[model samples]
Target chain A: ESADLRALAKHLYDSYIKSFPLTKAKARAILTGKKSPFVIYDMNSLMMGEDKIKFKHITSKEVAIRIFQGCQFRSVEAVQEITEYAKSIPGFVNLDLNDQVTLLKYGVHEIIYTMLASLMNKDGVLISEGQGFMTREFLKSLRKPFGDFMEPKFEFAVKFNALELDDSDLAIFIAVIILSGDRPGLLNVKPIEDIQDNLLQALELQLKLNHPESSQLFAKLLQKMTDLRQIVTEHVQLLQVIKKTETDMSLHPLLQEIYKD
Target chain B: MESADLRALAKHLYDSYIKSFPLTKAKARAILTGKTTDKSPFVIYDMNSLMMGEDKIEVAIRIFQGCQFRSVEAVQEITEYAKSIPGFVNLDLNDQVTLLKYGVHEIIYTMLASLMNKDGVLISEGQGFMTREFLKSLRKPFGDFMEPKFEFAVKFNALELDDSDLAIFIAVIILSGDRPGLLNVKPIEDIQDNLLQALELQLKLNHPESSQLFAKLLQKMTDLRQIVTEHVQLLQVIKKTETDMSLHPLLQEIYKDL
Candidate 1:
């Protein structure tokens, strides 16, 4: 392999590692221009344990908006290709939000892979490391909740579309209840103004997933204010958490410290 | 989840394992269920790892194919949508082929995932994985051997074709070389006629990758002749050796006995 080509490949390899961190040893092997069918063990190892779901309620719509903004062109097409490539990915199913994010993260690495393949052809020496070596760090990053928090105390605001209960909405609603635990007026019930008596009563009959008889009363909790913001504003705080403790736990530690009033 | 749903999920899980043979159990688990957001030591399953049997392999394929066929409309929309997307418009023919083939594969699995999510609403999944770059591409002799098939398959199916059946038909084409497709790409055409010319130049260039490909083709061409010639040459050599040794006592005795 020519020194010129090797230099270009190494530059790109380092950049890819920066974007999605991998073990230094594996990264070095990959850039060295090794032979085909390379194996780097433990890079893409799957965690064998009962799973838990992590949800990040677009704390800052700015990041959410930034992620998708202009993505249809600049990033979406690449994302679509990666999504297609992921079909044969040994471990692909309907990944909840977090898994979906991690999978999409590979988009950045893919550009590097393509560059290396084309470069190796020009250099007449194929360099490859096992897929594991490349994935170790990004895989490692998934061990905790993902977040980036900065604030001048921009308050969260949510407008309810409707409180008419859906079966799928039951779990989040129950979580909200657990969060409120025991606080007077923590359970606020406000029926939608437009809901007819018959329609309102029908929503109450919606059953939870495991509820027998498929008949249960959903006490419509339309707009509830459970935190200081609601108490101060008196216009039900859109972002009020039932308890500050739970809310703090959810945020990244830095953000929690920053947001502590 | 109900007993029925659990049973169905279990069946789906097992079916996935059987299809990707020589795949590790850990690989199988990762593909089906999302991994946890925690740190732990990851143990790699060896190539010979055993998995539980859920159904006959063919049955899983049938169920998958059946389910995937139902998503023709959605897949059609997504392919159409790809045109308006940014990077897709400028993709090369090979890239286009990879996109479409994997699209069908994606749509099929996405449908299965959707079904599993919604109480069996979308049960069927599609199967058949064809990549532009294959594991076989790793073999120096077999480089681009399947490029021809990939080129044809993409051109034949890339259009917004009408589906005669309700099920989306995901056609997998394996091409070993590039070709001028609807996109009017010429590298393939430029290269095809040059195969022999390139063959002649391989020894002069001393290109190992290309030479490997040429040597393979030559070996394949001479396979039968080589097999026959080897034994014949061995027998002739044996006769010459025997004749030269005939004057020896042991050879003379053997010849007399014969």
Candidate 2:
């Protein structure tokens, strides 16, 4: 029974990781400076409430908000992918309605940040939707508190990058995080925990076979969960502060619900 | 109170938890059923105690008492920390106890994770460390109950968090209004908000690199919640499957509703 479950988890991780492929040409275009990526927000026009929006020569604050929007896009996209991925898992849909919502509520940000780590290079995250790479130094150049919000993620991502985990590793790792039986309001924790346990055991076996030289990799990867949690907590705090002080900035309702708790 | 004072108080509470004795089955049985017979050698009749093939009833008694003792110690530690916080004591008595009852295990496990190294947690002051491998070797319910917590603790400890970071983190854990039966959510949320602000300020001054550290520590609260949820689930499993094991009254009262 255990062997069967482990094999199933391994299969799930291998196939799920391929769902989101990095568009290498976008990175190449940005690297060569041959093409400008889509600009989500122009700060000056946004500030003036003008009808015409100029994409070029905007201030760093404008660039930062665009980056924030780009992050939001990726996070939302990751959540969508997770929903589809969850459907493929054997027992996920069988869980109670409230338990399913509760798992997604707690799991979404952690998964978003974890997957976000995969896109990270030395500079910053590779944005989806063709926004290209938003450099860390540029992220740091935004207005005082606005700039401060971006640094925690950059810090976590840089360290996560150092671990050199591949996409398959993250796929199993994320599945474990999502299947957590620990979320409040879970209706049936035992079944969920059982699934989580199977995933973790499968991950351990996978790591041993994949990274034989690094015995510490499994424990170290688990530890990154603490890092992921910390980043998300700070992200929520950052959102709260932005909601309070930066009245002009628009926040998505889903993010608002996330921070409200 | 100043951040330094809060840090000191947090450290003192953590030390006290580590230094505090694990409540043994021997004493718990004596208190519960007034059985004066010293049937066991060690404080608790753990898996090692059963190798002698002790009576099944005696094993059940030991397990129940041992779990009861753990519950009491967890509650006591939460009380100590609540009293240490500057304004926590000033809250309504009902609110204080409500917070302690619901949040105790969360705080206990957070401290438990901190005490753990790569091997396993130190269950007692001088009794020596419990290896992860040894815990895994136990039979069904015991092994199943402990595994998830150890897994979470190992991951949590990997952050390499320090005392000051935990000081603020503990307050955030306790002051949360999300507990199912909180009477006045607004006041509790207010207290939590104030503590979060203080934590942010202290993080800026004390650890200049706190841009990362502060967020990381705050996030541990979510991690702590997850761990506690699993712990509670394990307890529930024990309640249902292990018909031979009788639960402590306090344990039943606190955990049954969840």
Candidate 3:
């Protein structure tokens, strides 16, 4: 089982995305857990032509709602995806369900952002349920503190896209992110650590197989996970801003769980 | 009789340390100076100096001051740790300070294990490593206190307590009934008994293989108590020998009372 981490790699890869892509149907199909590739493509490019207008939401409540529901719908779809993904990793379901909830609660945003990379470019990102595109300059225009949250994801997505990872490579990476031994409320850390160690070995094999040209990819990925922590810290504070600024907006129950301290 | 709150306390401390130890809040990592490649959760400051003195007392005073400053800063880190223990702040204020004044040394020494192993302890956050021999070589009272702790650390780390066990053990230490100036003895004793039972229950639950470790850990408390006693005795000796040395007032309170 140890050397056969390639086998474990296959198992996680099979879970995350042998079935996944970017169509209205693509993001929806993938988001809705339908059949598609987890490969990268432009949802916006397909919707493009001479007739299209540039997307910006800073001035329009309609655009804001559209962008909100679009991205929120995909990210919400991601929770169940991640829950099933964590459940797929060999040892996750074995964890105390409380630990399971804690692990999922803390790290899902990081994983969702990592997955969101498939929908992004450095200049802009796909949003509104992957049915559209918006530029970074546009997302950055939402003004002052409110401009902070959405654009950082485009930034993180740009760097993450540089890693050239497939859904399989990310399967173990996302698993490592969720089952992080450092999460606050785990009652049983030993097994989580044990499982993490095995998945790390599996992840190393995955990177060597899929990303053979890269050196130190595993170490590089761990440092990136650390980077994600700082990103999420800024993210949560900005989430606090949304609650204060838009008091009438109904944040989802699941969204509230992660956002609250 | 219930174990749930104890487990919850341990989890809270884990959350506390991770959140509290991040770069902004902790002086523990900030003090370390590019010490090593291997990093663990914490560090121990020791007495042995790289530079020797022409004037013996002046060098010893510097050596003592160096360790004292790290301890003073490190105590703030652990005070944050103690604050996160759920019921600790609810204790009477005098009892709270009294427990902290008495318990901080032992708690700090026990935590040394997290930064220590058979070879040497990590220092400067993950930046550097300091050796046991170096720590052991300090002149008189400094060397004297260092050896016992390193000896104890060597065996105590062998017991292999995790962060949760250490958190509860620290709580048990802080909630003791016996600290001088305790205004309410029974309430302090009551918390200690609950914590002590919680610790016993956890050791058996989590580490059943180390059947005798619970007893040995209690004995280690006595070892730490003896070292803490020796530390105060030596601290005062230095105070008399070198009249101008200053101590942190909280530590001064430990000296004044004990």
Candidate 4:
């Protein structure tokens, strides 16, 4: 059971990763100035302070906007992949239509954050269209509210990466989250719960059999759900701030729906 | 099924459930509600329930032991209940065990909160009940471990779910077939679906005045999972840091796979 399940989960995760094809080279090209003009701003630009604390662009406003746009594009693309993934799971489509939509609406961001951890190493996430890496320190150096949003996720991703989970672990874990029956407004939760339970058991058994040295690894992975919740909550708060302060940057409709609750 | 027959079925299920686990508080509630008037024979707590001041480490150890015992008993009862379900026992034995292994903690925590009141949980059957304040006041390491669950239970209790709702809820929790080793997932899913539908019906019939109660209950399930996850993390920390403190083999096994 453990071996076969591991293989299947790995296949699913690998396929998803391949579908995105976010290599360092591709990221660098997209982020490079030749391809797309970009700007990077320090936290000071967004900070409200005394005269000396006045807003200054760290890179260029164009670069910052370009990076944000890159993030947005990747986000929508991730959502598309997530939808495809969600549909592939057994019994997912059988859920009530409204419940399915609700699950995706609220769950996609958490899913994105979880999957995004895969792209991150200890330094920071590969952003700036993969052309430039966003160092954790640089992310924190930005202005108060705007910079606040990115830090929590960065912190979570770094910790998640430290867990040393392979693609199979992530694949099954993502499936469990997507199939969770406890989403608000779910009319028929039992099937969803059943799917989640099975995935969980499979994952647990696999972790135990595979990771002989790390006896507590399963507990650590389970604990990530709580961490994910905190990160997503912070993400939503950041989204709210963006909606209020950054009036020019319109929120995605799907995003608006996700934060509706 | 007639209303009376459904009531009987619900009552029987609830009776078997309380008996399978050492849930003295639940038994007391059943008796108080006149659902069952018979005295419960089972001891709710053993040495694990012992607590004293001054010895913080001992306090933590005892509390953890008590929790371990309670969960172990709950798991056994859950297995029995799962077996009693019509199609559940007929599934592959590996699938059955797999479901029990993964689903037990979630069910235990979900049901554990139900044993709570506004003040605190009943620590022993009718004999001992601890205030939330006193429990929090215990030594930092052990006392703090249960705080998240206490917070969750207080909010969950506000919803005031009754026996019928819980029976169906427990059913939904246990019959889940999504655990990876299942030879047959559909039948288990179908069983869970029926239980969920029945629960919705009962919630509607029982609480017509509160339209949002059912939704609130569903959301609580998500909240419970999160709480359990945190609790497991705490256990992992305890297992790692508290090297001298002995943990039960079963507890160790459960945490081993998380």
Candidate 5:
């Protein structure tokens, strides 16, 4: 089955992995002062690049509005990309399309936040895909509900990062989360359960080789998923409040489309 | 120079607020174009999700979700447009929320003008119509408060205010210092006065032929306050009537006293 597992890992990285810079050099650079890459200013004319990276203050309304707008632009891409990734998982395509959508809709945020761990360090997480970093302290400086929004993820992501999950580990882990069976309104649970069971087998095997030092890594990862669920429940409440408070920012319909599904 | 600033404000409000419908008077009529169905009086059929059955209601608890969820969508629309108003962010966070808490329902009714006809309003995106006769059948508390809204919408839309007029009306509604709980009235009143003057000037150009257009629109604001007061009065009846009735969280947060 490792043949199938290896092929499965093989396809996801090629077809789905969105690798960005995640290291201590720019990591160190980001913390000193978050960079304002030239693209954030002008996406149209891009001649000089990182050498021109400057900074902006995050304490104002402009930063609050722009950050949400930029985050939506990324989420629009993920909604399409994640759907394609979900369908590509073997056996996932065969399940009823409604259930496939239901599973992904419920699980999409967890998958994205899970992946964000790769882009994070204990200090802070990357924004606009590591082009700029938002420190925990500075993120706390943002306006109410907006400032507190990104902070909740750090505790969860930092602990998950401590697991040091590799690409193959994540590829199978996310594939498993999408096919997760307990969500409300699923018509075809048994087949999805069977699909998830098979994916978990691959994930456990991949985790052992990648994280051999931790004896209970598989069990711990499963528990962390339950932890991620608690966070999303709060994440959704914030989603509602932020909608009320942050009226100036437009939520992308695709983000709205997959939300609370 | 002042007129230039007012023109920019007028144009901004129209584009952000009312432009989505590309709304004209005929288009407003077209939006409420009704579809036929085996419609019955409102009843809560699905106890689980609170799906109303046969449109039947006897002050039933089941009407909660069916009645309230659509407004949650409207409120999101309201907040987004309201935030873009000039100097609105500078208001106290509590006052800003207080503004929305009071402002959303009036905005909801005001915007509902787009979907009203003489007899009924459209729901589910013009896919169906819910008539005033149909509402009257549901009886008091639920029916009584809503009928007034329909009366207001029909007349409000009859004025045939253009999109920009709708824009300034919303700004004027939201910026009122009279909204009852203000730590700071001076700045709020200043902004509202600026909007009124801008509205008065803009209307002279936009509807020069209507003559009394600006005065009537201003009159409609106080008119809305009259009906919205009754809505709150009856809404409490709704809260106390059905013990099992639950509403949207947004509703509970915004119009929460009941």
Candidate 6:
């Protein structure tokens, strides 16, 4: 009887895992739990081809993204706050420690750049669905599966939302770029034609999968390169002017002192 | 006029030290203000003692209280027989740094244990208010303040009423023995009441400056010996409970498996 009961308990535990999908709620189930390899690869493999000077965007965007990602995932509390900002900005990840940390590290200031980048896309159907279903709840749900033992190294303020919440998303994005530095490259670095082709293909996939009813939300993401041409033309000049004209330069004293000296 | 102004301010501040005082914040400001000299004798001596593979803050504190405590080996023997009565662990590096930037009193639990005057004659010591931050600049606020370069030969947190963070202060006091060489060492009998009186008086001043405080507290501390005696007796009873005096009846049968 003792042997039979032990066998039965093991079977029940195994069965629960198999039947349940690997959602946060079912992650702790013995059968369908999320598994991570103890010996995670620290391999970073990126190639700098013979033709290096052709694109500057990869160096700029990648560095920016890595910085953003690091800031985003600095603490558990920071991740939660970032989930809210990432909701309004598509292509920005507010959910998943990987996504939140990566995006925030890259550019807190570049959420609007992401908005513009989204406009250059042809994917309308997926964008609309993302707005409705893929908000902070998605990230919160993903966080549930990490299990109790993974006490992060950093201490986070449990209740405080930093005034520099915008910087969090930038941090995560930067981290992502750094982590994924080995990846082929960001869309910006490739040829304009390649960027356009990828966007078209991505849009086509969204249209074919059409579970969603609305496409207007998705249409905003598909602004062509030419459509963004004028805005792109003035961006640097506009930034310089803003930097010069902004009245409240309440800059860090160290920066002022550097110039003062 | 300057002396009068200074005296008046110092008196007012010292009088208000306990009541309506922002203890931790004030302590932090004092350490950071740059007006007060960084070197405090209490801090320096403790730092040197700590480096010598000795964590017996209480021993040093005894010295501060004008009572000569045992050396490292003696401390070991004392501990083997009976450990400290009641005290919190000493402040670690991070807590010490935070106390300077923040305030010593901010850590209430550590403070109460360190400073409680009513406890036994022994107490532990640590850096209470003055922080290591004064000695080193941190990598924040745009990295302007380059390197930290300052030294205090001796510094110790002040002994206060509450247990919160009083261990370091108490230990330092016991080590430094702030009795101003008040001792009576009779050569014939070698009667060492001076050290005893100095230790007692130091503790008395620590208590509220009230009459009969010494007599009353002396009665209380005398009770500690009884408490220690009862504890040792209780331990023997516990040991007997743990040891089964009789051998097992089936000792041979149990050995058969082996």
lDDT assessment of candidate 3: 0.65
Binned by DockQ into CAPRI classes (incorrect, acceptable, medium, high), candidate 2 is incorrect
> Which candidate has the highest lDDT of all?
5
Where is model 1 chain A poorest over a 10-residue stretch in terms of lDDT?
A148-157
The residue pairs that clash in candidate 5, if any, are B41-B55, B41-B56, B42-B55, B42-B56, B42-B57, B43-B53, B43-B55, B43-B56
Q: lDDT values of the candidates?
A: 0.28, 0.62, 0.65, 0.63, 0.66, 0.26
A best-first ranking of the candidates according to their lDDT comes to 5, 3, 4, 2, 1, 6
Comparing 2 and 6 on DockQ, the stronger one: 2
What is candidate 1's lDDT per residue for A174-261, written digit by digit as tens?
2222222122232221221111122222222223322333221131131122222222332213124323322323455664454332
Root-mean-square deviation of Cα positions for candidate 6 versus the true structure, in angstroms? 29.2
| Winner on TM-score (1 vs 4) | 4
Worst 10 residues of 2 chain B by lDDT: B24-33
- For the second chain, the TM-scores of the candidates in order are 0.22, 0.72, 0.80, 0.79, 0.81, 0.26
Q: How would you encode candidate 5's per-residue C-alpha lDDT over A1-261 as one tens digit per residue?
A: 677766766766555555323433344455446544223223222113323443221212366555654555565566666787787788888999899889987888888788766666666656544675455665555676766876777777776877667666777778878887667899989899777767766776677677776653565466467556657777888888877876565445664564423
- Ten contiguous residues with the weakest lDDT in model 3 chain A: A35-44
Question: In CAPRI terms, where does candidate 1 land?
Answer: incorrect
- Give the Å shift of residue A87 in candidate 1: 35
For residues A121-235, what per-residue lDDT tens digits would candidate 6 score against the true structure? 1111011112111112222222222111111100111101111112222222222222221122333322322322332333323432332432221221221111222233334
**What is the C-alpha lDDT profile of model 6 across B1-258, one tens digit per residue?**
243443343333233333322333344334433366652212322345434423422332223222112122222232221112111113233322222221111122222222221211112222332223321322322112111111101111222232221322222222211112222212201111222233234444456444333222222222222232333343345346534222223321222212
lDDT (C-alpha) at residue A117 in model 5: 69
TM-score against native, each model: 0.17, 0.49, 0.46, 0.50, 0.43, 0.17
In model 6, how large is the Cα lDDT of residue B154?
A: 13
Interface DockQ of each model: 0.01, 0.05, 0.02, 0.03, 0.01, 0.00
**TM-scores (chain A) of the candidates:** 0.18, 0.78, 0.76, 0.74, 0.77, 0.24
Q: Which stretches of candidate 1 lie over 4 Å from their true place?
A: A1-261, B1-65, B71-74, B90-95, B118-258
For model 4, what share of native contacts is present? 0.00
